[PDB]
């Protein structure tokens, strides 16, 4: 009885994924086993075992960021509270609820896809030249992969993508950096600029030469 849910969130922002039983009625914490884990990676986000309170098998990533509220558990609301979301937290999170009284049959299973996003730095341009000239546009720390576009600022038209070499880097924080070089022919009065696009965020950053 999986309920496909979608939760979009931002990095460093505390988000709440929900695993809700329709009944406002109560549950038995000494009977039920609760598991929050990723669908593919199967990494332990958090869990509830009847007779112990010390999550030692919680994964290093989620060691202290995944919290289930117990009073809400008894009320039937197994909702996870995720803190300080990181780019590696975009996963299909699976909440699974087994009742020992029914021979470990599943009473609740909900798959909550989590999308996360981040904002790139404002692009930085320069004008170094060679034989024709070259431009360098650098923007960093955004999620997911950025779309970079170059604009003929004089008339606000879009230059062809074959004029640019892009190399996106993985920041050690999971965020992305990008360096884009554009080689065009020499001309006076060539107002152009750079553009960083986060399609998930719907936000475009432009900077003139």
């Amino acid at each position: 009885d999986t309920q496909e849910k979608e939760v979009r969130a931002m990095v460093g922002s505390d988000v709440e994924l929900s695993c809700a039983c329709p009944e406002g009625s109560r549950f038995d914490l000494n009977d039920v086993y609760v598991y929050w884990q990723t669908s593919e990676s199967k990494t332990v986000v958090t869990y509830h075992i009847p007779q112990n309170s010390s999550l030692e098998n919680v994964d290093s990533r989620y060691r202290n960021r995944a919290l289930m509220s117990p009073a809400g558990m008894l009320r039937g609301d197994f909702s996870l509270r995720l803190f300080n979301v990181t780019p590696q937290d975009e996963q299909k999170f699976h909440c699974l609820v087994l009742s020992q009284s029914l021979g470990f049959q599943e009473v609740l299973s909900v798959e909550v896809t989590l999308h996360v996003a981040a904002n790139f730095s404002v692009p930085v341009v320069s004008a170094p030249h060679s034989p024709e000239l070259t431009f360098t546009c650098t923007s960093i720390n955004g999620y997911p992969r950025p779309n970079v576009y170059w604009i003929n600022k004089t008339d606000n038209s879009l230059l062809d993508q074959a004029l640019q070499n892009d190399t996106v880097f993985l920041n050690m924080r999971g965020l992305y950096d990008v360096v884009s070089v554009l080689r065009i022919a020499r001309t006076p009065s060539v107002n152009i600029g750079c553009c960083i696009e986060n399609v998930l965020l719907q936000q475009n950053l432009t900077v003139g030469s």
Partner: protein, 118 residues
């Protein structure tokens, strides 16, 4: 999401003879961005980056979208466990932080290979 599987899971080899460890970046990953190879020594339970080239020879097929490492002239203490880290058509600054990214849609280290040389 995207991850990387590596073979073999466990191998025992003879001293001096080369050993090969493969790795593939499973679909629907587009292409290999950069490859890293890590090994950890028996006791300290911490990994270290294997410097490519020389004794450790790497072969990469972008068409096959898979990479392989070869060890020559195996000292008896070349044993341990070996991971390989790949990335989905993007590049990384340092290998030091590749395995530190789990479930990232653009980075995954291998399952590991256990090696004992006699």
């Amino acid at each position: 999401g995207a991850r990387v599987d590596q073979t073999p899971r466990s191998v025992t080899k003879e001293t001096g003879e080369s050993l090969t460890i493969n790795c593939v970046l499973r679909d629907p990953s587009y292409a290999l961005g950069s490859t890293c190879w890590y090994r950890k020594k028996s006791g300290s339970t911490n990994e270290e980056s294997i410097s490519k080239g020389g004794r450790y020879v790497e072969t990469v097929n972008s068409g096959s979208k898979s990479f392989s490492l070869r060890i020559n002239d195996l000292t008896v203490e070349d044993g341990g466990t070996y991971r390989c880290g790949a990335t989905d058509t993007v590049r990384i600054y340092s290998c030091d932080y590749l395995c530190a990214l789990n479930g990232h849609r653009d980075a995954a280290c291998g399952g590991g290979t256990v090696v004992t040389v006699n």
